Design a protein around this ligand. Structure first.
Ligand SMILES: *[C@@H]1O[C@H](CO)[C@@H](O)[C@H](O)[C@H]1NC(C)=O
Lengths: 188, 207, 210, 190
């Protein structure tokens, strides 16, 4: 029920480049029944899909929001398709240095720039660090778990065996509410 | 001549890559393509086009309903009634976007070992299967550059062998230089289908 | 209704696996299908059999003459001419056909299942590819071990022209889906391809987990 | 490269049949000359493609046939090519095999039998290769290349590359057993 045949795909995805765009605006459009927002940034056309609760939250569209984009693919028309990653237009900002414990035991850290961060950004940045320094998605390393531990004991978990589910990429967290992150790498 | 009415879904190519899409209601079999009136299911003004012969003589006229992408994608049911003096009672045709859709499973297959030993051209095979409806697009990339249509061959979408619900499959072969494959650059098959979450998906391969 | 004459070649399946392959000469676009006369060349085989009137794709009438026992002169390279006379024709129509002489045999390849499917332990897809052949006509059959599989369990796509760099060649793919456990256990699976340019008419590629 | 080693192992390890007193009219099949005959509850399709197409222009009228299956077609007919020998005792033919045991050249004297005076190249090739397969690891792992060399009294010689199945057009060639002097095999180490 668990295998290593998609290892190259996960490694390619979570080692690829991400972008953090500010003040993004655009109206919502119907594309194949989906709610999308097309915008141009760095001389590149983007197609943001709103598929989770971000669909309800950005009914009107984006009016200057922050967007964390990751290329799902570039469609035949040159548009970069990206999912979720929208956080609010914020007039306040601070640094949160998040302790990242990685068990295979090793203390790491993870610096977040905004007061509202998307689960997409947390997932992608954590996995990229795991790919580049801890051997994730290489050889027999694929499965494991990211555990985002919030203040008070509540936790939010991500399975490393698959890409984060598109519907979860629009979920957001308050950076101040993060207590620490634990990763467990279960290798064979 | 034997008047027949058929209504055609918006081309998938237009829905997924065009800025416009239209339903097309065609009345074929007309001995005199005059006095055809179309009226449908309350939106934008539908343009009739010119008359045109079909096969084995006879004529035909069509009515395109422009700007139908959004209503189509919303789940709207369209109805087209065509009235003509060569039929007794005007004919009707209904059509709506499909439920019971299934995502394609997309696979890209390496070249046969024999061809790698030939060292001339190697065949890459893309397979999309398990999807419904049968309408699908297939494109190829080498690296991040899209290849022209003329360099590959996409078969028609055909129904799979299945005990149970109906699914479709499509193959596409792209033949490339053995040297390009062996030097290690990537190749990708891109598939468009209305049941995919992002409308398109992609599989990439290399040695 | 406009009359047209068409001469169709013997079915490949009959030439390679039947006793009785035949050419079909069809006169379509008739208002009244009686009164047709068909004259065949060469005239030295079994008697021609004219079929009953048929409707074509536009309410007109169609009648066809089949020349049975044609496999021998077809394979010998003789050219067949069919001449049709009908009251609805000012003058008789002629159609000519022969076995092609600029032919290429198929390159046959049997591809293993996609890696992803090998994780699902449900069904796995085997792909047979026959390419580089001419003429278009081709047969594809599947075997598991030494047993032929029924065609309810694979689907062969239509023969299509390849992207070309001069000479016209064609290609076909065929999709067979087998139980994963049969595939992992070590069974062999064979694609069998039939084509008139093949030395023995048929060839076979066999595959299992390397 | 070694991509077809398994196809070669299947073919040259498959069962061969030595039939005698075979008759049959020539028929046209897919443009080629074939002779169909039934032996041991099996329907056979014999292809005459070499010069035997001219030799057996009428068909067979009591000849010996050495049958190797290329495939069983969908009608159940075993397709085989050539291997026809004259219509008119055992002989033990000797065989030198040069293999590479890691770092040592090991020469082995071996042999195999034939039951006829005039013998076809198809029979010699198939029987030689079968024992190379069975006793010397040919078409296993990495062993696929090498050469069979058949020397004849007087000096005339014939070669057969092991990397390829014997050419179809060479399966109607025939020899006399008594004229065979040496037969030497080198198993090329890849
Ligand atoms: C309607 O859509 C079809 C879909 O391919 C297109 O070919 C045609 O040009 C379109 N015509 C109009 C008037 O929109």
């Amino acid at each position: 029920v668990q295998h290593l045949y998609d290892i190259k795909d996960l490694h390619r995805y979570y080692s690829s480049e991400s972008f953090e765009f500010s003040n993004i605006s655009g109206k919502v459009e119907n594309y194949n029944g989906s709610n999308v927002v097309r915008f141009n940034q760095e001389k590149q056309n983007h197609q943001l899909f709103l598929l989770g609760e971000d669909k309800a939250k950005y009914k009107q569209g984006l009016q200057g929001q922050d967007v964390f984009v990751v290329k799902e693919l570039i469609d035949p028309n040159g548009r970069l398709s990206t999912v979720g990653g929208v956080t609010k237009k914020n007039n306040q900002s601070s640094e949160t240095n998040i302790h990242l414990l990685v068990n295979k035991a090793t203390n790491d850290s993870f610096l977040i720039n905004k007061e509202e961060v998307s689960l997409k950004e947390l997932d992608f940045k954590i996995r990229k660090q795991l790919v580049e320094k801890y051997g994730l998605y290489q050889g027999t390393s694929k499965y494991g778990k990211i555990t985002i531990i919030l203040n008070g004991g509540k936790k939010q978990e991500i399975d490393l065996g698959d890409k984060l589910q598109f519907e979860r990429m629009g979920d957001v967290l308050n950076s101040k509410d993060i207590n620490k992150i634990e990763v467990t790498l279960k290798q064979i | 001549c034997h008047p027949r009415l058929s209504l055609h879904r918006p081309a998938l190519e237009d829905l997924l890559l065009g800025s416009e899409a239209n339903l097309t209601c065609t009345l074929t079999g007309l001995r005199d393509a005059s006095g055809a009136t179309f009226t449908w299911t309350s939106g934008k003004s539908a343009v009739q086009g010119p008359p045109e012969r079909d096969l084995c003589g006879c004529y035909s006229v069509s009515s395109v309903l422009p700007g139908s992408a959004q209503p189509w994608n919303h789940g709207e049911t369209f109805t087209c009634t065509a009235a003509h003096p060569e039929l007794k009672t005007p004919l009707t045709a209904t059509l709506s976007k499909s439920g019971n859709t299934f995502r394609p499973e997309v696979h890209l297959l390496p070249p046969p070992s024999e061809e790698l030993a030939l060292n001339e051209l190697v065949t890459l095979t893309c397979l999309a299967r398990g999807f419904s409806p049968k309408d699908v697009l297939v494109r190829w990339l080498q690296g991040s550059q899209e290849l022209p249509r003329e360099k590959y061959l996409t078969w028609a979408s055909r129904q799979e062998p299945s005990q149970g619900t109906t699914t479709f499959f499509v193959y596409s072969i792209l033949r490339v230089a053995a040297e390009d494959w062996k030097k290690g650059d990537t190749f990708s098959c891109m598939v468009g289908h209305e049941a995919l979450p992002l409308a398109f998906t992609q599989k990439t391969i290399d040695r």
